[PDB]
Amino acid sequence: HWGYGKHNGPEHWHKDFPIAKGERQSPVDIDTHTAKYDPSLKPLSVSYDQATSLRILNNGHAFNVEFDDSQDKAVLKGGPLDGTYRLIQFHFHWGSLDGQGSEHTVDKKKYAAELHLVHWNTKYGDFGKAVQQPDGLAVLGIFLKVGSAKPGLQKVVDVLDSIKTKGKSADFTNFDPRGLLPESLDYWTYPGSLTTPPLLECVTWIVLKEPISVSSEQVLKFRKLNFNGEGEPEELMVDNWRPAQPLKNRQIKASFK
């Protein structure tokens, strides 16, 4: 029964998921004055040309756009990573107001939202095995600010009416995740965790420096989603973000000077 309310939000998660107070929790604040350039970091390789989206699902905490991860169709490699990581889903976290919504922060700045493209390391065979490993997942995080519309998001926005409430799904084929990327692939990277229960410390985070812009109408449609199921009391799906956690014994590395 975890969520983002008063009685079940991030500050309660540790009772059921004690690693919430662990050594490698996410998100974190990215201090651009202490992150150090690492010349051994390689460019990211994002290979999404054969991506096969299947479905979109309201899981009661966000919505997931799901992919076929039974072949190396949409993969992330390079950067800080060893090996090949397959895209399984993306989702967002967003606010009730444009001044909050992101999970990571940059010099304490909160963005309106944050996109997470979730990938698992093919050496572990399946997502469920990957999340048990410290190098099991690679999550590409992309900030959203409100400004111009993002044309490549509009197909997602327009399906949201069909998945208003928890447990609803809809076919969602032929969606191209390349339309969600910024121009630059400059990034920060650090070792961390899932940002939702079970909060497993299995993620190499790759957070892009450059935000994407979405329109105020686009974000407004995110905020019409519901956390509840159909026929239950309506509670708008907003503020589904975990705040920054202690960095502890970690360094954030930058791919760029």
Q: Tell me if 116 contacts Zn ion by CB under 5 A.
A: yes
Alpha carbons 235 and 166: distance in angstroms, whole number? 11
**Catalytic, out of 1, 7, 12, 61:** 61
Query: Which candidate, 59, 12, 16, 18, places its Cα nearest to that of 201?
Result: 18
Q: Are 143 and 209 in contact (CB under 8 A)?
A: no
Range in contact with Zn ion (rule: CB under 5 A) among 23-31, 113-121, 167-175, 218-226: 113-121
Q: Which is nearer to Zn ion, 201 or 230 (CB)?
A: 201
Contacts of 13 (CB under 8 A, 6+ apart): 2, 20, 197, 199
Site for Zn ion in 178-197 (CB under 5 A): 195
Q: Is 150 in the site for Zn ion (CB under 5 A)?
A: no
Is residue 189 a known part of a binding site? Answer: no
Is 91 assigned to a binding site?
Answer: yes
Q: How far is the CB of 92 from Zn ion (least distance, A)?
A: 7
Q: How many residues bind Zn ion (CB under 5 A)?
A: 2
| Residue 194 Cβ vs Zn ion, minimum distance, rounded to whole Å | 8
User: Which of helix, strand or coil describes residue 141?
Assistant: strand
- The sign of the CA dihedral 205, 210, 214, 215 is positive
Nearer CB in complex with Zn ion: 84/195? 195
User: Does the footprint of Zn ion cover residue 119 (CB under 5 A)?
Assistant: no
Tokens 């410290």 correspond to 134
Sign of the C-alpha dihedral computed for residues 100, 144, 137 and 135 taken in this order: negative
Which residue has its beta carbon closest to Zn ion? Answer: 116
Residue 62 CB, nearest approach to Zn ion (Å): 7
Dihedral of alpha carbons 121, 249, 184, 104, sign: positive
| Residue 116 beta carbon to Zn ion: minimum distance, rounded to whole angstroms | 4
Known binder of ligand: residue 173? no
Q: Which is nearer to Zn ion, 55 or 71 (CB)?
A: 55
Retrieve residue 86's tokens: 């397959």
Residue with Cβ nearer Zn ion (195 or 204):
195
Half-sphere exposure of 36 (CA within 13 A, CB side): 5
> Which span sits near Zn ion by CB under 5 A: 11-19, 108-116, 127-135, 179-187?
108-116
**Measured torsion, CA atoms of residues 250, 13, 99, 238, in degrees rounded to the nearest 10:** 140
**104 part of the active site:** no
The secondary structure of residue 129, as a DSSP letter, is H
Q: Which is nearer to Zn ion, 38 or 182 (CB)?
A: 182
Q: Which residues are annotated as a binding site for substrate?
A: 195-196
Q: Report, as residue numbers or ranges, the catalytic residues.
A: 61
Q: State the residues that interact with Zn ion by CB under 5 A.
A: 116, 195
Q: Which residues are annotated as a binding site?
A: 91, 93, 116, 195-196
